[PDB]
């Protein structure tokens, strides 16, 4: 879809990531694994909750009998109720479709933004494979991996080390 | 062959299907169905107050005191009234009732 | 022998949901009647099988 990440450059999902909607996978000599990015996940959830709520709140708002001399009145009544019915059914079905579209794209965008964050952080200290993975030009241990994840990664620290390896 | 980090998204065994403008029958990891299709199939008391069952009496029949309708002679509070489409026991002595429908809209209040 | 806050000719509704397709004519406090056979919000994201 729109942001080109989900079913995008990142080709599939992770059945392996159970803690979140979006996250990381890493491998190094210390080990390998899936990690959810709990912030982005929860925030997206809050957004979706707001969305569906607002759909409920905005939507949240007897018969009669008539004689046989009352044919036009009766029909006027029917046409009215039926009219409002048609209008509300339309509004609902439509609102649901459109918001669905928006929702999927919202998720896509979230992924894209996460990826972007990591990329723009890591710079040329890594190779960017284009599958959603970055291969490091320097040794990245669990502290460094967490630093990437928690947004703190140190470029100048691994800079020239990465440089030499990227070159040779 | 160096150390590696990846970004990705959740997947599960979900069979859940939704439609969009661009696309129909899309599967999603999570969904909420907001339309309620089911009911208990019973006629019930409403806020702990029972409805008035007319049985085979018409509204008119009950208000007039049609003999068959004698079981409705005294009644408590009602949440709503239940009338058959064609009640047997209307006015026994035949005749008419003027402004009948208006009177029903009145009974509804 | 029953209790509801919402009533239709077909039966009674107890639900947390915004809409019902069950019947037009309803007494009590009730979800919005619609003509729809289904209304489903996507919340999670697309399920894309892996490799």
């Amino acid at each position, epitope marked *: 879809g729109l942001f080109g990440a989900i079913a995008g450059f990142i080709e599939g999902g992770w059945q392996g990531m159970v803690d979140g909607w979006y996250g990381y996978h890493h491998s190094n000599d210390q080990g390998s694994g899936y990690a959810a990015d709990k912030e982005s996940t*929860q925030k997206a959830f809050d957004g979706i909750t707001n969305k569906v709520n607002s759909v409920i709140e905005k939507m949240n708002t007897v018969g009669k009998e008539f004689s046989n001399l009352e044919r036009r009145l009766e029909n006027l009544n029917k046409k009215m109720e039926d009219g409002f019915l048609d209008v509300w059914t339309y509004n609902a079905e439509l609102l649901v479709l459109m918001e669905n579209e928006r929702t999927l794209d919202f998720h896509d965008s979230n992924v894209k933004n996460l990826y972007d964050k990591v990329r723009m952080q890591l710079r040329d200290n890594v190779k960017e494979l284009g599958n959603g993975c970055f291969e490091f030009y320097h040794k990245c241990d669990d502290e460094c991996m967490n630093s990437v994840k*928690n947004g703190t990664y140190d470029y100048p620290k691994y800079e020239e080390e990465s440089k030499l390896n990227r070159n040779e | 062959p160096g150390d590696q980090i990846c970004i990705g998204y959740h997947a599960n065994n979900s069979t859940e299907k939704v439609d969009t403008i661009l696309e129909r029958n899309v599967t999603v990891t999570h969904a909420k169905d907001i339309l309620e299709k089911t009911h208990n199939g019973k006629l019930c008391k409403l806020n702990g107050i029972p409805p008035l069952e007319l049985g085979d009496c018409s509204i008119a029949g009950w208000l007039l005191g049609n003999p068959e309708c004698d079981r409705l002679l005294s009644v408590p509070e009602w949440s709503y009234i239940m009338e058959k489409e064609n009640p047997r026991d209307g006015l026994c002595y035949p005749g008419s009732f003027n402004d009948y429908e208006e009177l029903k809209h009145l009974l509804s209040s | 022998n029953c209790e509801t806050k919402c009533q239709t000719p077909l039966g009674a509704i107890n639900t947390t949901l915004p809409f019902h397709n069950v019947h037009p004519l309803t007494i009590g406090e009730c979800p919005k009647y619609v003509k729809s056979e289904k209304l489903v919000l996507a919340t999670g994201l697309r399920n894309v099988p892996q490799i």
Partner: antibody
Amino acid sequence: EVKLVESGGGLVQPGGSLRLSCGTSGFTLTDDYMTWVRQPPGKALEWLGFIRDRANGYTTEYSASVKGRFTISRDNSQSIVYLQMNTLRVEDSATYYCARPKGYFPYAMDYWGQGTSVIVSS
Amino acid sequence: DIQMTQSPASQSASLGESVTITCLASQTIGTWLAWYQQKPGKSPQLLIYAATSLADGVPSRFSGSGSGTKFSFKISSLQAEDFVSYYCQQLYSTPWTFGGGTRLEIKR
């Protein structure tokens, strides 16, 4: 909104039994990860266990303090999570909450019930 | 299983001041800590999740920090109604343990 309410607390002979009910109300997007947490008065909070949503298989986990005695189950019909406590002991005396995450993923317990207290003595 | 050590168990301070509770994990729970307030005679209320991340509709004066084992929780501008119990909880692995508790008392 959600508003969990719990019920059924009382006094029991040890060896005895009790069944606690936490009912759920309100529109929500998730039933999953319904947890029982108790607080003996003056003491800290202690986590008893949880039961999961239908879709997740109704699976259940327990603290090894109460494991094998207590059982968590849910009747969706009445929309309640029951904690069925058997072979009650003296240290089981505490106040009891059901608590819930709001999300799909259990990062924290967002929704609490109001508590109900059970005592155990001879 | 997993042990959560919260200190100080009791702390006194006065209005407007800044107070810091610590929580310590026997394992590394990564970033799966959460922080709760308990007003007296009430159920707990969620304050922080994912250790450093404010729950919806919470005052900005409440903060949280840390990773792995060491964790911190801070009330920046102290307030009248803030003097109550606080608990950490580890949601990293079952059983989801709690800290000992922290009682906040107002200086007099």
